[PDB]
Amino acid sequence: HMILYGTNPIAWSNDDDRSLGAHITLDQCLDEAAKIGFDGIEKGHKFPQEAAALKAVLEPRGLRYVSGWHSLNLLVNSVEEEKAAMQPALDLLKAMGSKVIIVCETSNAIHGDNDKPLQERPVLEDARWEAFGLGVEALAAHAAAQGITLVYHHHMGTIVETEDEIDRLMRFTGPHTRLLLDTGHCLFGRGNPERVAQKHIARVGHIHAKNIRRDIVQDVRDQNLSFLEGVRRGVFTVPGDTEGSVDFVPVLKIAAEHGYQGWLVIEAEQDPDVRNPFEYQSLGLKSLKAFAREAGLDKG
Ligand SMILES: [Mn+2]
Numbered sequence: 338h339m340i341l342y343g344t345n346p347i348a349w350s351n352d353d354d355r356s357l358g359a360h361i362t363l364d365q366c367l368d369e370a371a372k373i374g375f376d377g378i379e380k381g382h383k384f385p386q387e388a389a390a391l392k393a394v395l396e397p398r399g400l401r402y403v404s405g406w407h408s409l410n411l412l413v414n415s416v417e418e419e420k421a422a423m424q425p426a427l428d429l430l431k432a433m434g435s436k437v438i439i440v441c442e443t444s445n446a447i448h449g450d451n452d453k454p455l456q457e458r459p460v461l462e463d464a465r466w467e468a469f470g471l472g473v474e475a476l477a478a479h480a481a482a483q484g485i486t487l488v489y490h491h492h493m494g495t496i497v498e499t500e501d502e503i504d505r506l507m508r509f510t511g512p513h514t515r516l517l518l519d520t521g522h523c524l525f526g527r528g529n530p531e532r533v534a535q536k537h538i539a540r541v542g543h544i545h546a547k548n549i550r551r552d553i554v555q556d557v558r559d560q561n562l563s564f565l566e567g568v569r570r571g572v573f574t575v576p577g578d579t580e581g582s583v584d585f586v587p588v589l590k591i592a593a594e595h596g597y598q599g600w601l602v603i604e605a606e607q608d609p610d611v612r613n614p615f616e617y618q619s620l621g622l623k624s625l626k627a628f629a630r631e632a633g634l635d636k637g
Pocket residue numbers: 490519545547604
């Protein structure tokens with residue numbers, strides 16, 4: 338199909354804080370993703386990282402390997418260092434048939450630091466944006482030469498969090514660099530996903546349908562909480578949840594009008610004990626497919 342629907346395993350077992358959902362085995366996560374009806378699933382920390390072993394657990398379940406998160410350190414390492422650092426991820430993605438690599442600069446990120454409030458996130462100095470963008474685009478060209486599209490994941494607690502910083506990254510990159518539009522991280526960072534899509538839809542190569550609970554976001558700011566504290570409180574949820582604040586249909590309508598093809602991935606990290614992953618991911622898939630139909634994105 339033109340539109341594929343994936344999930345991310347952090348709804349079961351968190352990556353930034355491996356104690357969240359540690360009791361949930363990989364087999365449980367993969368069985369539940371498959372039986373819910375997802376076309377594929379993104380990499381998680383409990384996934385095998387060799388082609389043969391990864392196929393052995395995904396192919397029997399009918400699950401495609403969507404992509405994998407890859408950390409960047411362009412602010413501390415040379416471009417050639419980062420090309421070597423990302424080559425193993427590209428080799429795995431090519432062997433699994435993936436078409437996309439998810440990247441994000443994490444050298445100075447704080448989303449994985451439980452003691453650092455989100456307001457103390459790094460802000461890249463203006464004089465360093467041109468060089469950083471040149472490095473990101475260089476990695477994008479390297480991946481593109483090997484058939485893989487690099488999509489940059491704007492993220493709370495990193496140097497690319499606000500709407501203005503998303504525009505800046507797009508301005509200082511291209512043509513190969515693409516944007517991973519994550520609706521949840523966009524709204525959390527005080528941006529509007531619909532407006533971001535209207536500007537950059539032509540450059541968007543991957544979409545994460547992530548919802549946010551506004552009241553929890555307000556708590557994070559008012560009480561000066563860390564990213565992981567927000568996650569444990571339920572800052573993120575799924576499409577179709579009445580407690581969510583993201584309006585998905587307008588975003589998907591912009592995608593439909595411009596002929597987006599690729600993955601819609603439900604990524605909603607939550608405390609699995611409180612927010613049952615099977616229940617919420619099922620609601621997300623049903624609701625996201627309905628929203629894609631209502632926006633004209635999915636014709637079938
Ligand atoms: Mn995401």
